[PDB]
Design an enzyme around this catalytic site. Structure first.
Site: not given
Ligand SMILES: Nc1nc2c(ncn2[C@@H]2O[C@H](COP(=O)(O)OP(=O)(O)OP(=O)(O)O)[C@@H](O)[C@H]2O)c(=O)[nH]1
Ligand SMILES: Nc1ncnc2c1ncn2[C@@H]1O[C@H](COP(=O)(O)OP(=O)(O)CP(=O)(O)O)[C@@H](O)[C@H]1O
Ligand SMILES: Nc1nc2c(ncn2[C@@H]2O[C@H](COP(=O)(O)OP(=O)(O)O)[C@@H](O)[C@H]2O)c(=O)[nH]1
Ligand SMILES: [Ca+2]
Ligand SMILES: [Mg+2]
Ligand SMILES: [Mg+2]
Ligand SMILES: [Mg+2]
Lengths: 54, 334, 434, 425
Positions: C10, C206, C254
């Protein structure tokens, strides 16, 4: 305190300090759950198309 | 506009605090479960500290210190004083106490056999002269109990040969400033002290509920409550000394010692939410004008005459300090 | 030498994976074209950095990494980024349409259609391993792919690699950067399904990263790039022991042995210091070690003073010697509330890597002379579970948004089954630390 | 590539639809000939969502124009951006629908609907990955209301797993063409309850009041009303058309906004709405105005209900720190108007490209239980006639039975009570 397990190498070292001593589902089962969810999607779609056919 | 929530309907003090907050017109009360508040007047038990300080864009403040129970539970208070180097086993202002599970029963029997040998057991209170009747009464109960030396020579108010205790109200703000309310109260017994009749629990217990159920309630002072101005006048007339010199210096010292000891454990200085709390310290004075600490109350009620002043002081120094709008306290410096 | 395979699932997992592999290359002196001049065994070797990088006959150092996402826009930036030459197309897997922030869509509907392809690409990497020790899995809790497909993949990895360890780096949802209202649902659903398949999981909230970026880096409104470069530094500090010579945490087993005495309670709290603005005095060993007990520096905001420790690891990078660590620990123990459970030793396992932390040129983090990441398994992290389970309870009582999950073939009973597991998890933390 | 297929039906649907394509073509730098002429790659980065690429890098709207009489469409073709549309995507008949839902849905529209589905299929077939459909139409007429909802039903039959989104203009006696509008609207609303994932409720009553009270237009025309709608349509689709993190496609938007499948009717809002304009707006002013009842397009008072979900979109160069600040301000000041059993139900997005003629703007999308007032209005006007069976002969003459009206009334009253249920929960 007591230091133990002190290992040293060129890029660093490590050790341990003690301040006080103490006082799965199978491939078949996963496939079954995935197909059951698939069949529930298919049933819900078939009910919709039946509704639209009416 | 600031927002707050109320979660202890039984709090006399914070029922008045919320009134003053609404009276300013700049505070607004929300429902119990609304998480978008600046101030929480939390429940007594199982306050969800873990859910505070996680709401984006809101400075959140609660009227209880997480971890302060260790000072406000009789069993944990005894353990804290013994095991804390800052207070130590030597501690002179705390009666010799022992925690007995129904555990330090053998170290109690040892110091008891060395020995006036009257003790008091409390969590429902027993005062006896023999250790066997004390331990038998504890094992009849299911709660963790503590016994300590009964002060066989208390300072007695005359006329009446009357016992008493001193209640002090202490407010600790979010910066861990320690504020002692200048007005304390004496809960006085109405019957003459009887050193040879510990079974009668009326002249030995100065609680308001126990004295209002002794046939001299209200004889010498209204509601068995004497305030500081009269007590200071009595000390000047009877003992040629003052409340400040003879008693209050020791009180301020004990309040400082107890609260400084747990500060690293409960301080919210760098926490994602902030805390203040009102404490009720209960003191005992002996005939040598030495002050003893009896108990620390984490959720105290106030004196009925003092509600208005103390609650306004809570709003002034504990709430408006964090949420400014458009001294009755003695700051105990440390 | 035993290889580690990284899997990024994701948007969060992929973008964090990008940040981490950029940092790994700078740390190991690998150029964006894949060449590594310091490596003299051209075309192979069993050095420590080979745990994460394979080698081609032409001297290219290729990450042992797979990127998977159900829509192509995030992984396309890997295909065309600074380190595009590092990866070959087989390692980058993209679908057409994403899971729409829906665990059930990521797990059941779309996951069923792509899981075999993903496992095939992982098998190709595993076939290059002489002794694979397991997998590091990066994903969000809140996304439909990060939550739903990860848990499916973790189940199948337990089947296809029964003896291999699995570690997670999980992004816990924070509303001031979150993109969905149903993220509490997705978080509980994926934790319930993954709990028995993960040996050790490093949760990163986050909210904590956001506030560290604002407070310490003076960034008014942090972006994902800001967050991910900080996260990558913490991840690198955790995985350095696998990638450099050393004697602490040298294999994935570990991590469990040193941090997880009870298998369900496998969520260590990470604390990192110092975080210094690059646009801004060098802190001592005592000061950065003291900073490890400040909630403001933790990857999850909670109060370790009101829990018990089960294990504690100190991972230092830079100019640090054991004598100063022990002097720092002795001072801190006298001045702080550090209570271990009775059946565990009150002790610290210390690792020092002399190479100071690498910073991305032009990033927001200043180069420092010494840093530390503390990994502590404390019951205080259960505050994060209680917060998440409470938001779940508020929505689920009214069955809000449940139709989206049921519409993808999930049964409503999976919600309550997942929630009960979380209630049992909260009981386990209570049974251990209070 | 996440394509959306646009459909506009009937007089109202085609007039607001033409203005929508006029507005977003300008924002994306597309001239009336279909050639790009902008100065930012943000304009082209997601342009395939609404446009196909033609020979010579020409951009053609993925839009289908539908009506049962040629008039409005002829006018569109003669319009400013008229030649931009694919000439094959004009699908029209001659009889008209006489402001009659039954003619649109059952007789006149039935004869034309297959031709429209042929054009939909040809557009859908050349989509790398179709997200779904957006329909613009009125509910008070015959073609947009009756044939529009017929189209939605047949599109769902053919594309059951694709999102269906509508911009639906709700009739008002204040701005009325015929007396039968409550009948047509009540019949259409039940179709929308069953067959749409997201419906933007645009109340002609609200648009008139905004033009008269706020914009100081003494005699508003339909053109003035359509100025507000196309501006609102541009705002609510900004998240789909430009690089963004939140509500970036139709399915994600629906998952964030719709907690219960039948409650998918949104109140849109826009700021600034100013009389004719050079004065710079501040973030506090955008935020206060976008949440003001006088800036909302559904003629419902949000203070009479509770917000289930809110999506806000800020456009222009401004401080995201201030945007986050002011948005958290509004929630924490009036937190009683947001349901507490959906935590963090207000989501904010920011786009750097502002609309034409503005440096800053804000678009509001609310799922509020106050929308029941709109359905209550229609139900009252429906019942006032239906109790005497007034004007029913226009519909029974097309083969409809009185029982279909009773069911539609029962269905919309059920929708109203469902809103009231969650307003008290
Ligand atoms: N720290 C951090 N959090 C992220 C990032 N991208 C998305 N998030 C967090 O991840 C969550 C959203 O999930 P995503 O990873 O964007 O979604 P996905 O896994 O691609 O799933 P779908 O888009 O629904 O198919 C939210 O809480 C965002 O704040 C990132 O690049 N860094
Ligand atoms: N060691 C001791 N020596 C003398 N008197 C004592 C004593 N311990 C307790 N007392 C008396 O017993 C009374 C009640 O004691 P304690 O403070 O333990 O109960 P409590 O918690 O119910 C009072 P409150 O609830 O109002 O703070 C006190 O007023 C005090 O006078
Ligand atoms: N806002 C707006 N409303 C319109 C417009 N044209 C018609 N209406 C409204 O639409 C309804 C009449 O439907 P109409 O679209 O003309 O009928 P159709 O051609 O059969 O679909 C009435 O409620 C009118 O007030 C327009 O251009 N703008
Ligand atoms: Ca080599
Ligand atoms: Mg008490
Ligand atoms: Mg995604
Ligand atoms: Mg008309």
């Amino acid at each position: 305190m007591e230091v133990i397990e002190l290992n040293k190498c060129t890029s660093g070292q490590s050790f341990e300090v003690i301040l006080k001593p103490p006082s799965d589902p199978s491939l078949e089962e996963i496939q079954k759950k995935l197909e059951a969810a698939e069949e529930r999607r298919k049933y819900q779609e078939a009910e919709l198309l039946k509704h639209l056919a009416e | 506009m600031y927002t707050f929530v109320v979660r202890d309907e039984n709090s006399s003090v914070y029922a008045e605090v919320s009134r003053l907050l609404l009276a300013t017109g700049q505070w607004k009360r929300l429902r119990k479960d609304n998480p978008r508040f600046n101030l929480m007047l939390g429940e007594r038990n199982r306050l969800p500290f873990g859910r505070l300080g996680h709401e984006p864009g809101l400075v959140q403040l609660v009227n209880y210190y997480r971890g302060a129970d260790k000072l406000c539970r009789k069993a944990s208070l005894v353990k804290l004083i013994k095991t804390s180097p800052e207070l130590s086993e030597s501690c002179t202002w705390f009666p010799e106490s022992y925690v007995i599970y129904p555990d330090e029963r053998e170290v109690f029997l040892a110091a008891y056999n060395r020995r006036g040998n009257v003790w008091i057991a409390k969590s429902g209170i027993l005062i006896s002269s023999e250790a066997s009747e004390l331990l038998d009464f504890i094992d009849e109960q299911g709660q963790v109990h503590v016994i300590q030396k009964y002060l066989e020579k208390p300072l007695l108010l005359e006329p009446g040969h009357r016992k008493f205790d001193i209640r002090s109200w202490v407010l600790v703000d979010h910066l861990y400033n320690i504020y002692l309310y200048r007005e304390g109260v004496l809960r006085t017994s109405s019957e003459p002290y009887n050193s040879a009749n510990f079974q009668d629990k009326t002249c030995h217990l100065t609680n308001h509920c126990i004295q209002k159920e002794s046939k001299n309630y209200g004889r010498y002072e209204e509601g068995n409550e004497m305030f500081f101005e009269e007590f200071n006048q009595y000390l000047m007339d009877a003992l040629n000394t003052t409340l400040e010199n003879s008693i209050l210096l020791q009180i301020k010292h004990i309040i400082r010692s107890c609260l400084m000891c747990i500060e690293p454990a409960i301080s919210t200085k760098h926490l994602h939410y902030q805390s203040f709390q009102l404490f009720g310290f209960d003191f005992m004075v002996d005939e040598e004008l030495k002050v003893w600490l009896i108990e620390v109350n984490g959720a105290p009620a106030c004196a009925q005459k003092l509600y208005a002043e103390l609650c306004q002081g809570i709003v002034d120094v504990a709430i408006s300090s964090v949420f400014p709008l458009a001294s009755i306290f003695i700051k105990l410096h440390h | 030498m035993r290889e580690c395979i990284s899997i990024h699932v994701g948007q969060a997992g992929v973008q964090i994976g990008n940040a981490c592999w950029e940092l790994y290359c700078l740390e190991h002196g690998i150029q964006p074209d894949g060449q590594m001049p310091s490596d003299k065994t051209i075309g192979g070797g069993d050095d420590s950095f080979n745990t994460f990088f394979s080698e081609t006959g032409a001297g290219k150092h290729v990450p042992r990494a797979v990127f998977v996402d159900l829509e192509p826009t995030v992984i396309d930036e890997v295909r065309t980024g600074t380190y595009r030459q590092l990866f070959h197309p087989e390692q980058l897997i993209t679908g057409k349409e994403d899971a729409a922030n829906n665990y059930a869509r990521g797990h059941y509907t779309i996951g069923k259609e792509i899981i075999d392809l993903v496992l095939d690409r992982i098998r190709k990497l595993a076939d290059q391993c002489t002794g694979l020790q397991g997998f590091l899995v990066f994903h969000s809790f809140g996304g439909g792919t990060g939550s739903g497909f990860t848990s499916l993949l973790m189940e199948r990895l337990s089947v296809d690699y029964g003896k291999k360890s699995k570690l997670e780096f999980s992004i816990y949802p924070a509303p001031q950067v979150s993109t969905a209202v149903v993220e509490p649902y997705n978080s509980i659903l994926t934790t319930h399904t993954t709990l028995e398949h993960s040996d050790c999981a490093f949760m990163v909230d986050n909210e904590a990263i956001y506030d560290i970026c604002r407070r310490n880096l003076d960034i008014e409104r942090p972006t994902y790039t800001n967050l991910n470069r900080l996260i990558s530094q913490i991840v690198s500090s955790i995985t350095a022991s696998l990638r450099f010579d050393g004697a602490l945490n040298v294999d994935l087993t570990e991590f469990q042995t040193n941090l997880v005495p009870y298998p369900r309670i496998h969520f260590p709290l990470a604390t990192y210091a110092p975080v210094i603005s690059a646009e801004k005095e060098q802190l001592s060993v005592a000061e950065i070690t003291n900073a490890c007990f400040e909630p403001a520096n933790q990857m999850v905001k909670c109060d370790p003073r009101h829990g018990k420790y089960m294990a504690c690891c100190l991972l230092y990078r830079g100019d640090v010697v054991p004598k100063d660590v022990n002097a720092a620990i002795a001072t801190i123990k006298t001045k702080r509330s550090i209570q271990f459970v009775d059946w565990c030793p009150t002790g610290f396992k210390v690792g020092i890597n002399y190479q100071p932390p690498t910073v991305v040129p032009g990033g927001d983090l200043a180069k420092v002379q010494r840093a530390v990441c503390m990994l502590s398994n404390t019951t205080a992290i259960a505050e994060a579970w209680a917060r998440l389970d409470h938001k779940f309870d508020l929505m689920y009582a009214k069955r809000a948004f449940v139709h989206w999950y049921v519409g993808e073939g999930m049964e409503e009973g999976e919600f309550s089954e997942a929630r009960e597991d979380m209630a049992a998890l909260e009981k386990d933390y209570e049974e251990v630390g209070v | 590539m996440r394509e959306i297929v646009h459909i506009q039906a009937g007089q109202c649907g085609n007039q607001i639809g033409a203005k929508f394509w006029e507005v977003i073509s300008d924002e994306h730098g597309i001239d009336p000939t279909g050639s790009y002429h902008g100065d930012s790659d943000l304009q082209l980065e997601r342009i395939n969502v609404y446009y196909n690429e033609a020979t010579g890098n020409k951009y053609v709207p993925r839009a289908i124009l539908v009506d049962l009489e040629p008039g409005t469409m002829d006018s569109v073709r003669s319009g400013p951006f008229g030649q931009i549309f694919r000439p094959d995507n004009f699908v029209f008949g001659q009889s008209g629908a006489g402001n009659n839902w039954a003619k649109g849905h059952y007789t006149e529209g039935a004869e034309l609907v297959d031709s429209v589905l042929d054009v939909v299929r040809k557009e859908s077939e050349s989509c790398d990955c179709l997200q779904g459909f957006q329909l613009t139409h009125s509910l008070g007429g015959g073609t947009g209301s009756g044939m529009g909802t017929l189209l939605i039903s047949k599109i769902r039959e053919e594309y059951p797993d694709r999102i269906m989104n509508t911009f639906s203009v709700m009739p008002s006696p204040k701005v009325s063409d015929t007396v039968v509008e409550p009948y047509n609207a009540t019949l259409s609303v039940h179709q929308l309850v069953e067959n749409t994932d997201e419906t933007y409720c645009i109340d002609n009553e609200a648009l008139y009041d905004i033009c008269f009270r706020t914009l100081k237009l003494t005699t508003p025309t339909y053109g003035d009303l359509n100025h507000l709608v196309s501006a609102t349509m541009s705002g609510v689709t900004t998240c789909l058309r430009f690089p963004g993190q939140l509500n970036a496609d139709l399915r994600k938007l629906a998952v964030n906004m719709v907690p219960f499948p039948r409650l998918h009717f949104f109140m849109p809002g826009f700021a600034p709405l100013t009389s004719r304009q050079y004065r710079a707006l501040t973030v506090p002013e955008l935020t206060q105005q976008m949440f003001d009842s006088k800036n909302m397009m559904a003629a419902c008072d949000p203070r009479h209900g509770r917000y289930l979900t809110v999506a806000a979109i800020f456009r222009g160069r401004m401080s995201m720190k201030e945007v986050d600040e002011q948005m958290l301000n509004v929630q924490n000041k009036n937190s009683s108007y947001f349901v507490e059993w959906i935590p963090n139900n207000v989501k904010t997005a920011v786009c750097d490209i502002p609309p034409r003629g503005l440096k800053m703007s804000a678009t509001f999308i609310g799922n509020s239980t106050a929308i029941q007032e709109l359905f209550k209005r229609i139900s009252e006007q429906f019942t006032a006639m239906f109790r005497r069976k007034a004007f029913l002969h226009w519909y029974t003459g097309e083969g409809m039975d009185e029982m279909e009206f009773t069911e539609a009334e029962s269905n919309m009253n059920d929708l109203v009570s469902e809103y009231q249920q969650y307003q008290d929960a």
